[PDB]
Design a protein around this nucleic acid. Structure first.
Lengths: 380, 96
RNA sequence: AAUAAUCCUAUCACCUUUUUCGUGAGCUGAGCUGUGAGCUAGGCAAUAGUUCUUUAACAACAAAAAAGAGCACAAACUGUAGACGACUUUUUUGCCUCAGGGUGCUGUAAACAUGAAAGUAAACUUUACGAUCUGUUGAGGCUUAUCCCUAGUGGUAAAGUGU
RNA sequence: ACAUCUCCCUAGUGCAGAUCUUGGUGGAAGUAGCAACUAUUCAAAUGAGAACUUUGAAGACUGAAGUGGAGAAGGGUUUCUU
RNA sequence: AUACUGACGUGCAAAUCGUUCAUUUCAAUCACGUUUAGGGGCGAAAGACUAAUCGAAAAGCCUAUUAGCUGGUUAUUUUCGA
RNA sequence: UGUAGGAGACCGAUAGCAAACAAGUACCGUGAGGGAAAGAUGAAAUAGUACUCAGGAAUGAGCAAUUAAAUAGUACCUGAAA
């Protein structure tokens, strides 16, 4: 018989299996689509989540209850070392999907790039990319010509520069980035000219843009159904347990109907967060990088005592509105929206009033060490 | 063969283990660390050091201890690890 | 406008004489040789006693000559991971280790005051006893274990296994 | 120690099974499990070999309604040395 | 031995263990010895108890009781066949 | 029934007396009582494993060795099936 009282099912069926991701690096499912009128440009970037801060922002929001008045908001900080392009990928459309024709490489590569292939860099003779050290420039040109002629999608093989970071890892993350815009020839000219250079996030993105965020979630191992799916807890009276499972269900199917909640992995899942606004694209050489029109005071983005488990910011950085999937220290993938967002909020231009640089370890009030010293005074 | 003088922060080592088993496990960690340092399976451990550690009961460790390790032959090869008495461990870097 | 009811296409063994055309190879476009195709002239082969597969196709391997051109696992380290595998790492432009600094957290240590302190008793005004409080004292302690920084100290082995 | 089909008598005379009877044996499985009763460590000795033997040092606990002494029932050489 | 319809429920145990709870100077509790025996005893009554046994104990026998009912009921070919 | 003979178209070690035997025993039951499992080396052990080597020892191996025979070594005949 039917249930007496109705009540929505626990959790989404559409994110079965609730299992571990097979890569640390975020995986872009799909890229931005055709726009021949637009000039060629990069679609994506990897950067590392350093932590969270809060902001004070002045609000326009027409007809709002808050309206004109200022708001305080949480924000994420992502240190972004410039990615380096090392390869060109030429893909061609088939009724079996996109297929690679060939890849064309740069005329030298990083040690950090080579480290990703080696499992035992320390105990090896490091012979990778040494027959493929060089070939005739004619061969390269022929491959480029071939790709222009036959390929219909261009991706650039890019890689991270972890040597510009405090992290334990020295292996680069290597990555394809689709190039979206004009003709394949115009694109090819664009990637070739760009190639060996380093790409700041400011070269890829503009402040105020809405951005799509691709990351693996924070782990937790294998967890019970209550934790995993949020079902109503067992009664005070039971034969056994309280985080112990409900009924599985009907005699027909004469099998477990798969839609039932179950114990198993929780977190370390791949996930796309959508439409996060860029509040500031920071500059490495700016010593005023946390300051605002209201503040106008020399002051770097780095918190008091730095970010938890990451410390100082020493490269360029993205100040992003709101939450981001995964642990601090994790690589995070930024992608442009597949169709550009059109909204009030998308169009809008942020005016910060304050960026916090207080401690995130304890309740350390001070923006600067100098302020802390100034408060306390003489010491022994 | 060599004689070294080291400072062990026991507090970090002792961190994960319950009250009852704190001092025994810390002693086990002491034997394990000394083994690791001198490259010796046979680590002979000072009763006086254990007594010094255990003197405020098993429930808590000293935060920091200065240990003296002696690698000794008599293939066969062992080390002897023993207590060093001092007021406090402020600034006391490792040495040979 | 019967569309495979079509076209292609086999089957002139030989060697030797004669004339032509295609293509490959060596020499210094060309000449010659080879190869493929033809024409011209000769006299030259087959053969197991009647059928019981007409061994005729494709692919793989062993020997013999001739010629051509190192990784991974483990171990330690890690903890963005984890029941255990697995996963993330690093292994001397590092790492571990302590120590210092940063960041903090607790709340002012012991020690000493012929300091203060409700009263107390014993000298001939001085000397005893006294919870407590103040001072020296934002003092003392603790802070990577899953904090940050430091090329600051001392360390940094096994040497195994699969291919 | 064995046959008779030459003939014929005789019988505790023919099993897959009875939650058969009896005996052995598997799969289940190197699994369930060895969770009352706060805790052991170091060194030494013995020995072939020591987390749980012995000695010492520590740490701990029983906490006089005691895992301490005595006795009754009941057991009966379990005692003790070697 | 009230409740947690607690733990336990191939147990530490064929009724244990934990916590809670009732009892504690009398119709009290305990020991030992003693009495009453099977259609019998004994029962502050529940058909209670009378040695892991009870709306009739245990032991042995009449007995291989009886059962229109349940289960099982053993080599082969050929012939007639409900 | 006790003892003594003589028997067999009897059983042949799950059979035959409960008992081929150190069985009316062990063992179980408060007791009355209940009541097992349990034979075979070889002709000869006055042929019962000598010797050596490796082992802490158990054991193992042997150029060593009894026997006609040791995948015949006393948990010893044959040694099926699972």
């Amino acid at each position: 018989s039917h249930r007496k009282f109705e009540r929505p099912r626990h959790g989404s069926l559409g994110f079965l299996p609730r299992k571990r991701c097979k890569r640390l690096r975020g995986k872009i499912r799909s890229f931005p689509k055709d726009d021949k009128e637009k000039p060629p440009h990069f679609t994506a970037f990897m950067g590392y989540k350093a932590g969270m801060t809060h902001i004070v922002r002045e609000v326009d929001k027409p007809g709002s209850k808050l309206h004109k008045k200022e708001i305080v908001e949480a924000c994420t900080i992502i240190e972004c070392a410039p990615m380096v392009v090392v390869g060109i990928v030429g893909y061609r459309e088939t009724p079996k999907g996109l297929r690679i024709l060939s890849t064309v490489w740069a005329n030298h590569v990083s040690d950090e790039f080579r480290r990703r292939y080696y499992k035992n860099w320390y105990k090896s003779e490091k012979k990778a990319f040494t027959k493929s050290l060089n070939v005739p420039e004619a061969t390269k040109n022929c491959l480029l010509k071939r790709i222009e002629k036959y390929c219909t999608v261009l991706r650039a093989i890019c890689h991270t520069q972890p040597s510009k970071t405090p992290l334990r890892m020295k292996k680069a993350h290597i990555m394809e980035v689709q190039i979206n815009g004009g003709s394949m020839k115009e694109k090819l000219e664009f990637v070739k000219e760009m190639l060996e250079k380093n790409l700041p996030v400011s070269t890829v993105f503009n402040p105020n843009e809405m951005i799509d965020v691709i990351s693996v979630t924070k782990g937790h191992g294998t967890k019970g159904v209550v934790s995993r799916y949020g079902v109503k807890r067992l009664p005070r009276k039971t034969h056994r347990g309280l985080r112990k499972v409900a009924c599985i269900g009907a005699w027909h199917p004469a099998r477990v109907q798969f839609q039932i909640p179950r114990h198993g992995q929780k977190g370390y899942f791949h996930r796309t967060e959508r439409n996060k606004k860029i509040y500031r694209i920071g500059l490495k050489t700016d010593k005023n990088s946390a300051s605002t029109d209201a503040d106008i005071t020399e002051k770097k983005i780095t918190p008091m005592g730095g970010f938890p488990h990451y410390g100082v910011v020493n490269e360029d950085f993205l100040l992003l509105k709101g939450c981001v999937a995964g642990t601090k220290k994790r690589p995070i993938t930024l992608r442009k929206n597949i169709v550009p967002q059109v909204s009030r909020d998308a169009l809008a231009q942020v005016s910060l009033k304050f960026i916090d640089t207080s401690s995130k370890i304890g309740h350390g009030r001070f923006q600067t060490s100098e302020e802390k010293v100034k408060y306390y005074g003489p010491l022994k | 063969p060599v004689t070294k003088f080291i400072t062990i922060n026991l507090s970090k080592l002792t961190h994960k283990v319950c009250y009852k088993r704190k001092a025994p496990r810390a002693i086990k960690e002491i034997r394990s660390i000394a083994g690791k340092l001198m490259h010796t399976k046979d680590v002979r451990l000072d009763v006086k050091l254990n007594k010094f550690i255990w003197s405020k009961g098993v429930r808590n460790p000293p935060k920091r201890v200065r240990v003296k390790l002696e690698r000794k032959r008599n293939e066969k090869m062992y080390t002897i690890v023993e207590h060093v008495m001092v007021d406090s461990y402020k600034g006391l870097v490792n040495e040979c």
